[PDB]
């Protein structure tokens, strides 16, 4: 399985780097109630 | 309750007039467990009960 | 000297950064317990009285 | 009352309701749909709990 | 010969049954039974040493 | 801040001593001690024998939060002392058990 290990390892690395550049630091803004430091979200929703 | 957006959380039992005639005055002493196991959700609850 | 406003304790500190705008916290329930030696200027000849 | 972020000071009012789980074991056609989903490994821990 | 291979085996089995009855308590608490287990740990050790 | 072990013996010795000051100004009426805790493995039978052999003091034990610690000893303490037992798992449960 050595030859497949190499492949999978290099796949993750490549995608990891592409991911890096592509969306590095683009996920730091969320909706907030005005003035407060609380996150605004519906019921069964995850902060996004 | 819901016709404005402020909602009353008034309980008769809680009231001071109700309490003085409920019972006799008292020397209490709140004893709290602060061992490691309490830390967590439970520790949070105790500070609000006392 | 006694007044309708509740008797206050401490310097009031509320954090504006952590009050979400529409939830309605409790207002007050304390009794208005002003003392005679706090409604008037204290003497030693008034603590006797 | 419900408490946002478990804050004994920040609560909203909600009506009470008797709810039924979407996947149950009431009859044999229900328990079975439940088992198919537990067999696809999708959401089986919820059912388990 | 025959049972020293088995005595030691059951010893390595009882220690397993012991690592598992243990109860992890937070912030450093501890039930009186975990203490009993630590005490038994020394025996287990001297048998493997 | 919570850390360390749990000794239900130094907690009720300190409580009884506090209850017996009699130098200070006091209510001198109902004498009661209430403990907030989650689970207890020790009933502390010895402290209650002497400090309150005749049951002058009343003990109320509160078990709080969602947890697996044993509640039998705490219930026993409450029963022994003519107090009561109250659970509190939740914030909405605080308001009717701390007045009850
Ligand atoms: C035989 C294979 C079936 C696998 C088991 C599926 C069982 C699911 C089932 O029994 O559905 C009944 C479902 C129960 O309803 P309930 O959860 O009580 O909710 C209230 C509904 N008003 O209420 C329903 O109406 C579900 C009925 C739909 C049944 C599913 C249709 C199956 C079609 C499969 C076709 C593909 C077959 C090809 C196979 C290729 C390789 C295997
Ligand atoms: Ca404990």
Swiss-Prot record, chain B:
Motif (MIDAS-like motif) on chain: 33-37
Post-translational modifications: Proteolytically processed into subunits alpha-2-1 and delta-1 that are disulfide-linked.
Superkingdom of source: Eukaryota
UniProt-annotated location(s): Membrane; Cell membrane
Tissue specificity field: Skeletal muscle.
Binding site for a divalent metal cation: 33, 35, 37
Function: The alpha-2/delta subunit of voltage-dependent calcium channels regulates calcium current density and activation/inactivation kinetics of the calcium channel. Plays an important role in excitation-contraction coupling.
Subunit details: Dimer formed of alpha-2-1 and delta-1 chains; disulfide-linked. Voltage-dependent calcium channels are multisubunit complexes, consisting of alpha-1 (CACNA1), alpha-2 (CACNA2D), beta (CACNB) and delta (CACNA2D) subunits in a 1:1:1:1 ratio.
Remarks, miscellaneous: Binds gabapentin, an antiepileptic drug.
Domain notes: The MIDAS-like motif in the VWFA domain binds divalent metal cations and is required to promote trafficking of the alpha-1 (CACNA1) subunit to the plasma membrane by an integrin-like switch.
Sequence similarity: Belongs to the calcium channel subunit alpha-2/delta family.
Protein name as it appears in the record: Voltage-dependent calcium channel subunit alpha-2/delta-1
Encoding gene (name): CACNA2D1
Shown part of the complete sequence: 229 to 278 of 1106
Swiss-Prot record, chain C:
Compartments (UniProt record): Membrane; Cell membrane
Posttranslational modification: Proteolytically processed into subunits alpha-2-1 and delta-1 that are disulfide-linked.
Tissue: Skeletal muscle.
Protein's job: The alpha-2/delta subunit of voltage-dependent calcium channels regulates calcium current density and activation/inactivation kinetics of the calcium channel. Plays an important role in excitation-contraction coupling.
Domain notes: The MIDAS-like motif in the VWFA domain binds divalent metal cations and is required to promote trafficking of the alpha-1 (CACNA1) subunit to the plasma membrane by an integrin-like switch.
Miscellaneous field: Binds gabapentin, an antiepileptic drug.
Assembly: Dimer formed of alpha-2-1 and delta-1 chains; disulfide-linked. Voltage-dependent calcium channels are multisubunit complexes, consisting of alpha-1 (CACNA1), alpha-2 (CACNA2D), beta (CACNB) and delta (CACNA2D) subunits in a 1:1:1:1 ratio.
Family, as annotated: Belongs to the calcium channel subunit alpha-2/delta family.
Record-given protein name: Voltage-dependent calcium channel subunit alpha-2/delta-1
Gene expressing this chain: CACNA2D1
Full protein stretch here: 528 to 576 of 1106
Curated annotation (Swiss-Prot), chain E:
Coiled coil: none
Entry's localization field: Cell membrane, Sarcolemma, T-tubule
Tissue: Detected in skeletal muscle T-tubules (at protein level).
Glycosylation sites: 30
Post-translational modification (record): Phosphorylated. Phosphorylation by PKA activates the calcium channel. Both the minor and major forms are phosphorylated in vitro by PKA.
Transmembrane feature ranges: 3-21, 37-49
Ranges per topology, Extracellular: 22-36
Subunit architecture: Component of a calcium channel complex consisting of a pore-forming alpha subunit (CACNA1S) and the ancillary subunits CACNB1 or CACNB2, CACNG1 and CACNA2D1. The channel complex contains alpha, beta, gamma and delta subunits in a 1:1:1:1 ratio, i.e. it contains either CACNB1 or CACNB2. CACNA1S channel activity is modulated by the auxiliary subunits (CACNB1 or CACNB2, CACNG1 and CACNA2D1). Interacts with DYSF and JSRP1. Interacts with RYR1. Interacts with STAC, STAC2 and STAC3 (via their SH3 domains). Interaction with STAC3 promotes expression at the cell membrane.
Protein family: Belongs to the calcium channel alpha-1 subunit (TC 1.A.1.11) family. CACNA1S subfamily.
Protein name: Voltage-dependent L-type calcium channel subunit alpha-1S
Organism: Oryctolagus cuniculus (Rabbit)
Taxonomic lineage of the native organism: Eukaryota, Metazoa, Chordata, Craniata, Vertebrata
Shown residues within the full chain: 50 to 98 of 1873
From Swiss-Prot, chain F:
Post-translational modification: Proteolytically processed into subunits alpha-2-1 and delta-1 that are disulfide-linked.
Residues listed as glycosylation sites in the UniProt record: 23
Compartment list: Membrane; Cell membrane
Tissue-by-tissue expression: Skeletal muscle.
Entry superkingdom: Eukaryota
Similarity comment: Belongs to the calcium channel subunit alpha-2/delta family.
Note: Binds gabapentin, an antiepileptic drug.
Assembly description: Dimer formed of alpha-2-1 and delta-1 chains; disulfide-linked. Voltage-dependent calcium channels are multisubunit complexes, consisting of alpha-1 (CACNA1), alpha-2 (CACNA2D), beta (CACNB) and delta (CACNA2D) subunits in a 1:1:1:1 ratio.
Role this protein plays: The alpha-2/delta subunit of voltage-dependent calcium channels regulates calcium current density and activation/inactivation kinetics of the calcium channel. Plays an important role in excitation-contraction coupling.
Record note on domains: The MIDAS-like motif in the VWFA domain binds divalent metal cations and is required to promote trafficking of the alpha-1 (CACNA1) subunit to the plasma membrane by an integrin-like switch.
Protein name: Voltage-dependent calcium channel subunit alpha-2/delta-1
Native source organism of the sequence: Oryctolagus cuniculus
Origin organism lineage: Eukaryota, Metazoa, Chordata, Craniata, Vertebrata
Gene: CACNA2D1
